[PDB]
């Protein structure tokens, strides 16, 4: 409680699944939150389900939209004050090998998963540096930033890019005394309403050869490690990878 007192957070893809859980715990801990998403009717209902407009609001945004990132920071500023916290959580996945990826699939996945993260990090540094905010940029990666999957080629590429680009930004902010930290969070398989919509998916994911615990995780498993990284508890952590994956990458 009150672990995120005074923080102002943006969370991209914050209307569903992982990102909505992070938003929920960020509010329980005293943060003010702006969540983004592509659809207004889902996003306004999501934001109302968590709290009141003095706590959490919704902004319609495609994270691949460069100019929209500026509007998003302005609106959060106008609504809640200077932003201290950015969680680049919006992503999309394509189920193709490298061999079978079309160039339109490639470009479309990188625009969201890699350009978007770049645009959010670049603008985050510019807007949060040198303000005594205890600023933190949590860049959502995944186990596929560590290990390959034969059927997630373009995804593997985007999550490996975000893993190492985040270490570049972390160093620059640390060396220039910007008072910004940058870290990546790497979920394993997490249960979400989307997974529930794929018969047998969670079953395949829960096999011991994939997830040693024999089950998959839940959205709050990721929300709790983002709380830690958003708060001043983690003021000495930057450039690091935080894995919550049920044992996946240990074997």
């Amino acid at each position: 409680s009150n672990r995120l007192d005074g923080k102002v957070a943006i969370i991209t893809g914050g209307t569903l699944g992982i990102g909505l859980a992070i938003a929920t715990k960020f509010v329980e801990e005293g943060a003010k939150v702006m969540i983004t998403g592509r659809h207004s009717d889902v996003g306004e209902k999501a934001a109302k389900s968590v709290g009141t407009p003095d706590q959490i609001q919704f902004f319609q945004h495609d994270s691949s939209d460069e100019d929209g990132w500026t509007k998003l920071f302005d609106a959060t500023e106008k609504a809640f004050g200077p932003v201290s916290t950015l969680v680049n959580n919006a992503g999309i996945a394509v189920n193709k090998s490298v061999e079978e990826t079309t160039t339109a699939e490639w470009r479309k996945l990188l625009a969201v998963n890699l350009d978007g993260v770049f645009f959010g990090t670049r603008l985050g540094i510019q807007r949060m540096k040198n303000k005594g905010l205890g600023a933190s940029i949590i860049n959502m990666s995944s186990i596929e930033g560590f290990v390959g999957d034969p059927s997630l080629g373009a995804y593997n590429a985007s999550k490996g890019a975000v893993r190492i680009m985040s270490k570049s930004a972390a160093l620059d902010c640390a060396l220039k005394d910007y008072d910004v930290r940058v870290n990546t969070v790497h979920p394993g398989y997490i249960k979400t309403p989307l997974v529930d919509d794929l018969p047998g998916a969670e079953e395949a994911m829960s096999q011991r050869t994939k997830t040693p615990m024999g089950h998959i995780g839940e959205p709050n498993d990721i929300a709790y490690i983002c709380v830690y990284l958003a708060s001043n508890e983690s003021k000495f952590a930057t450039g690091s990878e935080f894995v919550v994956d049920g044992g996946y990458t240990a074997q």
Copy 2:
């Protein structure tokens, strides 16, 4: 607050520096703690400085002493109840290259840093498995588990051994549904009264070529990530490495 409600923790080397901070935060969050150390007068005073005997007690133990590990678990059991949490934090360091390490230095450093951790992990699994405790074994490693240091040969070996042996134990517990998690924590350079006792040490450690933040950390920086791993917030994390190092291993 109350993030560690009901937990029973042992912390080795818990009378000083990092381990005493972990003990302190473990008590603030509702855990019952037994700290160990080699000297009674320091350990009884340390334990009294944190709280009352219903909260925290001291047990005299050298972590390289196999038979003493049994006494330690029994006494914690008798005092506080079944143990749910073990932090293998006791260690010693030798400032020698591999070339200049004597065999007595080698054996003496491995008895504490590697045998001790083994004895604590082995007995932890045996005593905590299959009890619905939400058991967690936090094995203290360090950045020297990732990267070499020309003047910490035997240390590098012990912290690399603990890094990978902890992943073995994590898998076995996960696959056998033991309800035990095992993880490693890797501090960078941390300020402790011992460091303060070395003129110019912290100065050398704080140089940007070592620690990009330009400063070193503090004991609570490690206590907060142990709280996270001791609690049920991290129930989906096992076999993973958690680095709090100011950027050291990012460059």
Copy 3:
């Protein structure tokens, strides 16, 4: 000698520095080589300096040009036979932090360093699979695929993407018994005529805090590890990272 007997290799960016050394050793060991580059006068002179047209030829190509990759494989096929070996070595670097990267710099660097590698790998698999060739795709990464550099943001992102996308492709080829291997090579700082053109560069690179050997390497240091990976000596290596960096990433 004759370690690359019968192999047919494409090497992108093969007219200069690292890529020209790889081409040279590939020819000394019995491979037939096609090198690419952006300028005909340099590329025709480079190719003539190594050997005769029955051994090595030049093809004008920008690796970011998708359609040109098809022409390149056809022409190599027509000239030398079925391709067994692809070295995605062409790259460009931008000396900017993430904070100071413009979007045109970002896109331009990713088109060469990441799209290009994708196009070469995707087409390599399609053209080399299932032909008993002992096919090998060596994807040129660098130490910046492992660690961040505060002034190479977009570069770090491209080399982290190539590191993990190569593991995806390696698995798919292995699981489908394609007889293709995919691996990444990670040079540290290497002396090239370009570096010689930056007064004080090599001096800054050779400092012990960067390169522990106190010097930087030479192009042949990378050519010898590509020989190993192009040949059947490495038929059990796939999805792995091979680092030749003077100690850079060890500390």
Copy 4:
């Protein structure tokens, strides 16, 4: 051919399997070799099967025997000249979880796999430094230096220790301009007469969930990467990990 001209190599555990293949290729490439082993009748027959006493000889040694390491270097010196190359390849394995490891199993496995490597590396540096030899210490690790196995607890610990202790030694030698390199080699599952002696072993090892290639490797797969590291081709590689594992650690 002649890639190891003038080199003088010791290979521990060099009478069988992996180590005997390394010895064989080291001789084919012009090196003089001393192999060690615990049994004279196997070791003298092995050494005779490779070549004549001017090329390769056998020395009876337990690598856990400190004082014997001195005799071994002296005898190689007397027989072949100053040693340039050490391959710490002798090891033993115990098939137990951390939970089920007895302390005698623990100590016995660490004496060979970790003390032995220490003794060989420490004495190697002392005897090979500053002699213009192009000295190379190849420390045999394995995939279990990267990832855990639920039934190889003490093994995981020894191979993680050797992975990181080798980086310490590599840095010290590089910084002091000793003309010694230190690297680790990490085989995956390799077919040896011992494996052939376990019905169904290779079958279990060759499953795609373990080894993506669907088969295991052969001893020469490790011999060829040791050739590369023993020779001056790799003069810019130190502190690095070289993995030949069929894809095991890529997924």
